[PDB]
């Protein structure tokens, strides 16, 4: 009943909180930090928690969740936990073991959401980005419809409450939506989304197909060189974002998060700082005017931060299509 607990109904009948906590930290950050900041996020009132095999943190995020069930009280049903199937486990016979492996590290019985992390299959193995003798990433060929059938099987087995996708384009989503014998459609498409890349067209598509758009990188990314060019423009330093922040006596980050809430986008926010974690949940304590939203819509410039350019030659690279 406190606005911060607001949820949206998914196309499978389950409910997803509209604000999520992003948990990815680059490898240099101490592993035990994820435990502390996830506990802090739950204390702040975050209930939707986003992770993945790739983030190498599920043991730590699971510990924080279970500790807060044991006590800083939440109940399991109050938490909405997302994991993601990484590209090297897209072959049908390794989809379910990949989920069960994540659940073993988490020490939870189910995930609330399990996503295909990208539409791109990579060579099976222990290295997430497997490379050849020239340092080019090695690709794999998989029918994504067969991968999706095993995701459906995981939902039927009770191991994932809901299933979805991440970083899919409209034609790729359509390949799943128009699959013969489809049992469960994606609940969501988690994509990069912020005022410089507002995803109008993909958002319209998703809404027309009863798929939730979930915004990652909603504050312009953490700007880490593994994934993001440091010469790229700094979203939160934008003088128009800052002028609206000041008008509202908030911060640029809060403006960027509120933008998404008011357009019907579910939004993630990563912070490993206690004060900013507590600040971010204040997105529910103010409103942008319709005039503010039209100005924010005018910041759109089709600028993508997470380009994954070392995967540009993959047949199923998602970002070369218009949307
Ligand atoms: N599916 C995918 O392919 C994919 C890709 C990228 C990300 N994600 C998910 O999306 C989550 C969010 O992405 P992200 O971590 O790249 O970036 P983000 O949420 O766009 O932004 C995080 C950056 O904003 C800073 N920040 C947070 N709150 C702030 C505030 N109130 N004021 C000023 N700065 C603030 C953070 O620093 P501090 O930590 O110091 O507070 C961090 O450097 C990830 O954790 C992950 O869960 C998914």
């Amino acid at each position: 009943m406190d606005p911060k607990y607001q949820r949206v109904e998914l196309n499978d009948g389950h409910f997803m909180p509209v604000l999520g906590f992003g948990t990815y930290a680059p490898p240099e950050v101490p592993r035990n930090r994820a435990v502390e900041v996830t506990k802090l996020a739950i204390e702040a009132g975050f209930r939707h928690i986003d992770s993945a095999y790739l983030y190498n943190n599920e043991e730590q995020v699971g510990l924080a969740i279970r500790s807060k069930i044991a006590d800083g009280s939440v109940k399991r049903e109050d938490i909405f936990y997302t994991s993601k199937l990484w590209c090297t486990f897209f072959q049908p016979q390794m989809v379910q073991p990949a989920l069960e492996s994540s659940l073993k590290k988490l020490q939870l019985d189910y995930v609330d959401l399990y996503l295909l992390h990208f539409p791109m299959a990579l060579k099976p193995g222990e290295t997430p980005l497997p490379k050849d003798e020239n340092g080019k990433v090695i690709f794999d060929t998989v029918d994504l419809s067969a991968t999706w059938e095993v995701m459906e099987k995981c939902k039927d087995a009770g191991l994932a409450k809901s299933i979805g996708v991440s970083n899919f384009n409209y034609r790729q989503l359509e390949m799943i939506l128009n699959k013969p014998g489809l049992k469960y459609k994606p609940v969501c498409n988690q994509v990069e989304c912020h005022p410089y890349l507002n995803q109008s067209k993909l958002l319209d598509f998703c809404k027309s197909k009863d798929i939730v758009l979930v915004a990652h990188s909603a504050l312009g990314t953490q700007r880490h060189k593994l994934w993001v060019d440091p010469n790229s423009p700094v979203l939160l330093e934008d003088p128009v974002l800052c002028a609206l922040a000041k008008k509202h006596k908030r911060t640029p980050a809060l403006i960027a998060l509120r933008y998404q809430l008011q357009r019907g986008v579910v939004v993630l926010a990563k912070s490993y700082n206690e004060q900013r974690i507590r600040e971010n949940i204040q997105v529910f304590e103010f409103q942008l005017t319709s005039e503010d939203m039209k100005v924010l819509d005018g910041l759109n410039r089709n600028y993508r931060y997470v380009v994954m350019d070392f995967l540009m030659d993959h047949p199923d690279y998602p970002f070369s299509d218009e949307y």
Side-chain angles (χ1 to χ4, degrees), residues 1-74 76-103 105-125 127-132 134-135 137-274 276-323:
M1 210 230 160
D2 184 304
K4 78 183 166 187
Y5 302 126
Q6 192 199 324
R7 295 191 302 170
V8 67
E9 194 176 14
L10 302 175
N11 63 42
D12 68 5
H14 291 296
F15 288 86
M16 181 188 274
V18 303
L19 178 71
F21 182 64
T23 65
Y24 178 70
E28 69 256 22
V29 179
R31 263 25 235 152
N32 66 354
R33 182 68 182 159
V35 184
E36 183 77 356
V37 301
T38 304
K39 285 181 185 172
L40 289 167
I42 291 167
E43 291 165 22
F46 283 91
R47 296 289 175 269
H48 175 171
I49 297 160
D50 188 87
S51 190
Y53 162 94
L54 187 72
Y55 308 167
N56 186 38
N57 71 17
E58 280 188 308
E59 194 177 336
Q60 284 84 30
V61 175
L63 183 51
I65 289 164
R66 291 184 289 108
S67 170
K68 295 309 254 197
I69 297 165
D71 246 43
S73 271
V74 283
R76 182 58 189 97
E77 61 251 43
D78 301 331
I79 296 292
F80 189 98
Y81 178 75
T82 299
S83 195
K84 308 186 198 84
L85 180 71
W86 183 245
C87 305
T88 53
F89 305 100
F90 277 16
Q91 282 177 23
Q93 80 278 352
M94 50 199 328
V95 167
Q96 191 171 317
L99 183 52
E100 289 175 321
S101 175
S102 286
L103 288 177
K105 293 186 77 62
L106 290 161
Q107 285 177 240
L108 302 176
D109 295 312
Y110 65 89
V111 298
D112 294 84
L113 182 58
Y114 203 51
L115 308 184
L116 299 183
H117 206 142
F118 280 95
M120 292 178 281
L122 304 178
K123 183 203 172 85
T127 313
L129 290 167
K131 291 182 204 287
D132 65 5
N134 302 124
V137 173
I138 309 171
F139 313 144
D140 190 24
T141 51
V142 177
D143 182 5
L144 279 174
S145 274
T147 310
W148 190 255
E149 279 178 23
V150 186
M151 295 289 285
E152 292 175 329
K153 190 189 181 300
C154 289
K155 171 163 164 60
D156 280 327
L159 303 174
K161 295 302 199 187
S162 296
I163 57 185
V165 303
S166 189
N167 303 301
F168 275 49
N169 66 40
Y170 122 74
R171 284 178 181 88
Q172 288 166 338
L173 283 170
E174 277 223 321
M175 291 271 294
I176 296 177
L177 291 174
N178 293 319
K179 170 199 181 313
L182 182 67
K183 205 183 170 177
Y184 305 123
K185 60 200 267 184
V187 290
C188 69
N189 191 15
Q190 189 184 119
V191 298
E192 179 174 346
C193 193
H194 46 79
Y196 289 168
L197 188 76
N198 77 27
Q199 303 279 19
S200 284
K201 274 178 139 165
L202 188 59
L203 176 59
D204 290 352
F205 176 74
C206 286
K207 281 172 173 177
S208 77
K209 261 39 168 114
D210 193 20
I211 298 167
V212 169
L213 192 147
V214 181
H216 73 66
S217 306
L219 308 177
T221 84
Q222 49 186 117
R223 302 183 61 77
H224 199 276
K225 280 201 74 165
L226 286 170
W227 318 106
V228 179
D229 193 319
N231 293 329
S232 72
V234 191
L235 181 73
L236 296 188
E237 289 176 12
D238 188 286
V240 167
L241 253 197
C242 294
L244 296 196
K246 180 164 170 184
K247 176 197 176 175
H248 283 286
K249 301 178 195 295
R250 301 283 163 175
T251 62
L254 275 175
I255 301 297
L257 298 179
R258 192 65 197 190
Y259 175 64
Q260 306 296 2
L261 292 188
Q262 290 187 212
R263 12 153 41 203
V265 172
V266 167
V267 68
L268 304 176
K270 178 263 172 182
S271 186
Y272 268 43
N273 184 261
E274 188 180 345
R276 298 189 275 275
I277 289 165
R278 294 183 182 187
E279 187 183 291
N280 289 345
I281 201 89
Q282 298 181 326
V283 69
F284 296 104
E285 289 177 20
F286 82 108
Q287 294 169 276
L288 296 164
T289 70
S290 53
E291 289 69 54
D292 295 329
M293 295 288 297
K294 203 193 176 157
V295 153
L296 293 164
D297 285 335
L299 292 178
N300 193 40
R301 59 200 59 180
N302 201 29
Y303 192 90
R304 185 184 299 283
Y305 292 104
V306 189
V307 173
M308 306 295 283
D309 68 5
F310 55 89
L311 297 185
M312 272 181 170
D313 288 333
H314 199 292
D316 313 310
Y317 176 76
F319 308 140
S320 40
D321 284 3
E322 193 213 333
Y323 70 99

